[PDB]
UniProtKB/Swiss-Prot annotation:
The keyword Cell inner membrane does not apply. SUPFAM superfamilies: Lipocalins. Octadecanoate binds at residues 127-129. Belongs to the calycin superfamily. Fatty-acid binding protein (FABP) family. The keyword Transport applies. This is Fatty acid-binding protein, heart. (9Z)-octadecenoate binds at residues 127-129.
């Protein structure tokens, strides 16, 4: 059910990422480098387990999870969160919870592009990834 999300994806558009990072309390120097970074996201499955890698010249992350099962995560900005990823309306919805705060990372496919929408507080960031062969 997750299969069209699988593969290697490269960042090709970013809107409001600084707003999102600011909302999370990321410092100006980190936001500055991040605003010029173009990550590669790799999504793989092995049975029920998904692994999502995010690689860049600045920071790298990797998570593994089962859909619908909570997991601990330490984010790129060093938040220790409780996470769950589900399919909802054909979108891959990742919810992170910490200190009573929530942020969502929603992925959807539009015309073969991967659109990642990041919401925290009032900040809404939209990042577009295109598929590597
Ligand atoms: C780890 C790969 C590099 C992520 C970009 C540069 C580093 C940002 C650090 C500070 C904000 C981190 C916010 C949470 C993760 C955003 C994930 C956004 C995406 O997958 O496109």
């Amino acid at each position: 059910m997750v299969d069209a999300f699988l593969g290697t994806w490269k960042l090709v558009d970013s809107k409001n990422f600084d707003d999102y990072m600011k909302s999370l309390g990321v410092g100006f120097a980190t936001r500055q480098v991040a605003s010029m970074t173009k990550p590669t996201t790799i999504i793989e499955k092995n049975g029920d387990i998904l692994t999502l890698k995010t690689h860049s010249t600045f920071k790298n992350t990797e998570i593994s999870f089962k859909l619908g099962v909570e997991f601990d995560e330490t984010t790129a900005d060093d938040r220790k969160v409780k996470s769950i990823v589900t399919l909802d309306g054909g979108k891959l919805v990742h919810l992170q919870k910490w200190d009573g705060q929530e942020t969502t990372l929603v992925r959807e496919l539009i015309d073969g592009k991967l659109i990642l929408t990041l919401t925290h507080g009032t900040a809404v960031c939209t990042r577009t990834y295109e598929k590597e062969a």
